[PDB]
Amino acid sequence: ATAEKLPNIYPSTRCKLKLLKQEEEKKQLEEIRGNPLSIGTLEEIIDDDHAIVTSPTMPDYYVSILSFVDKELLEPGCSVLLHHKTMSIVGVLQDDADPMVSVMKMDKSPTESYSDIGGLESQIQEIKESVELPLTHPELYEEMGPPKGVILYGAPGTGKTLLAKAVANQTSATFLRIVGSELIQKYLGDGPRLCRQIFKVAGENAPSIVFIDEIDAIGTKRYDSNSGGEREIQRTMLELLNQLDGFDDRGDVKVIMATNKIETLDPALIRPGRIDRKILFENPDLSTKKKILGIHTSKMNLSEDVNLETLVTTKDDLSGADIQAMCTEAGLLALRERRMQVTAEDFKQAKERV
């Protein structure tokens, strides 16, 4: 019943919304603008209430806004309403788009939740406390403050990758995942711009979760700045460091570091007092493995021949992925068996393969 009343309520809202007298006045304000008008890009600004512009055809005319909307709403080098006469700024014009930055996984409150990934919790506190904790922002207030970022280690797809979005999901900020090998280019200086573009986003879309994976390459100080040593290595990293060592947060924009090559990196690349956090994924001990086991093992359908301990003890200290991985091809064997309920044998097989 009330659904009807709810629907028309939604409807009446649409009406008033569309109802934006003022309409004429608004149209009067449109009837001002005339039409059709001309796109054109900003360049600089003065209080002049005249400013000149930028065009692909490149007329650049010194022009006023039609003033109700604002100059300060916009930045130099931005497309603006222009007439076709003088290309008069008609007002605030987006120039919305900018849907690109260098190489990233563009995602927010991502799929991975710490529940999902198999129990890693011992280090989840690390990532939770350093980030998720100030993400609540409540206690961190009294805490007086929160580190910048963390450093993952161990294996991706179990420790490194799975954890990565866990708190990223949990805090529900903008999770930005990248690889340094997803930077460069071998050329000099946009590696920074890559970061910049990223940091543009990072600065822009805050809160966000910065992620970084496998700095094997852009991060190695070597011993030398010369004799074949590619500047861009440091040249990038330093700038990445500049925005890194130029920012830590109280719980807004959070960083993640995922890689196995550790001291390839500068100490201030960590800059303790800022990055306090090393996550390192290990082979989960039989219990902790069992912790992840029961998760992925059970979520895999199977026949009661299967047992965790049947799998648990038989193991070499696998990765928490190999859990998944054994579990993975395990059913694949049952698929090669063309069955929907997996035996215990496939598991041992699938593991002793993988």
């Binding site: 039409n35 059709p36 008008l37 001309s38 796109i39 692909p56 788009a97």
Partner: protein, 51 residues
């Protein structure tokens, strides 16, 4: 008579300024489509009422 008007019909359109193709950059709420003509640059311009 079908012919006549028809043969006559072409006579008008022979008078034309031109017809601009365009490459739409986008639209906005304004109902002025935001466009870069291919040889020209970008203009944000109104649409036909029929669309």
């Amino acid at each position: 008579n079908d012919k006549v008007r028809f043969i006559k019909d072409e006579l008008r359109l022979l008078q034309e300024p031109g017809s601009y193709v365009g490459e739409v950059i986008k639209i906005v709420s304004d109902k002025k489509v935001l466009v870069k003509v291919q040889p020209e640059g970008k203009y944000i311009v109104d649409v036909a009422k029929d669309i």
